[PDB]
Amino acid sequence: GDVCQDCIQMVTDIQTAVRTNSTFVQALVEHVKEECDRLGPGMADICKNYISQYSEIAIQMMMHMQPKEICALVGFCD
Amino acid sequence: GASGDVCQDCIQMVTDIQTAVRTNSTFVQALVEHVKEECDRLGPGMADICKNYISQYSEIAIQMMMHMQPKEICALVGFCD
């Protein structure tokens, strides 16, 4: 679909950004951690530790598969 | 450069996702069914915890993403700005 093709385009350029931009992943992880602040006082911290331990497996898992597999896994393709 | 392409791809994809929710009656169903099936890779007690965390919070997720411009959504996930 349209959303499927857009997702493959996005994941392809994200893997390109991780390969070429050294600060892309750091800035992205810092931004998602900054969006954990919208939770409560105690529960923002577990959100940032959730990213702190699962960003690595997410980024490396993304870079070890093809983009159509990524979008098939997320749900925008097939 | 490479990250600006990611921002452009995000705007296009989120705009087409908003269109697909407004124009296809089965898009949201199939998407949340696939996300619930993807919870099964976790532990057997907590695959169901994952599934009903998706169930309790799919309504906020779809409706909040509906009442938002695609640029705000991409800025929130970090692919833009």
Author numbering:
A (entry chain A): 1 to 78
B (entry chain B): -2 to 78
List sentences from the manuscript.
Four mature saposins (SapA, SapB, SapC, and SapD) result from proteolysis of the precursor prosaposin as it traffics to the lysosome. The saposin family members are disulfide-linked, four-helix bundles that usually form dimers. SapB presents a variety of ligands to several lysosomal hydrolases, including arylsulfatase A, β-galactosidase (GLB1), and α-galactosidase A (GLA). One cargo, globotriaosylceramide (Gb3), is presented exclusively by SapB to GLA for removal of the terminal α-galactose, and failure of this process leads to accumulation of Gb3 in the lysosome and ultimately results in Fabry disease.
To determine the molecular basis for SapB binding and presenting Gb3, we expressed and purified recombinant human SapB from E. coli and co-crystallized it at lysosomal pH in the presence of Gb3-NBD. Crystals took months to grow and were bright yellow, strongly indicative of NBD from the ligand in the crystal. Third, we dissolved washed crystals in 0.1 % formic acid, subjected the sample to liquid-chromatography mass spectrometry (LC-MS) analysis, which indicated the presence of both SapB and Gb3-NBD. The SapB structure revealed a homodimer consisting of helical V-shaped monomers that form a ~2,900 Å3 binding cavity lined with hydrophobic residues. Given the above evidence for Gb3-NBD in the crystals, we were surprised to see only weak density in the ligand-binding cavity. Additionally, several hydrophobic residues on one face of a helix in the binding cavity showed little density beyond the beta carbon. We interpret the result as a collection of disordered ligands in the hydrophobic cavities of the SapB molecules in the crystalline state. Absent any cargo, the binding cavity collapses, and the cavity volume is minimal; but the presence of two Gb3-NBD increases the pocket volume closer to that seen in the crystal structure, suggesting that the SapB dimer in the crystal structure contains two or more ligands. Moreover, because the chains of the SapB:Gb3-NBD dimer align well with SapB dimers containing ligands, we propose that our structure represents an open and multi-ligand-bound SapB. Our simulations indicate that an open SapB dimer binds at least two Gb3-NBD molecules.
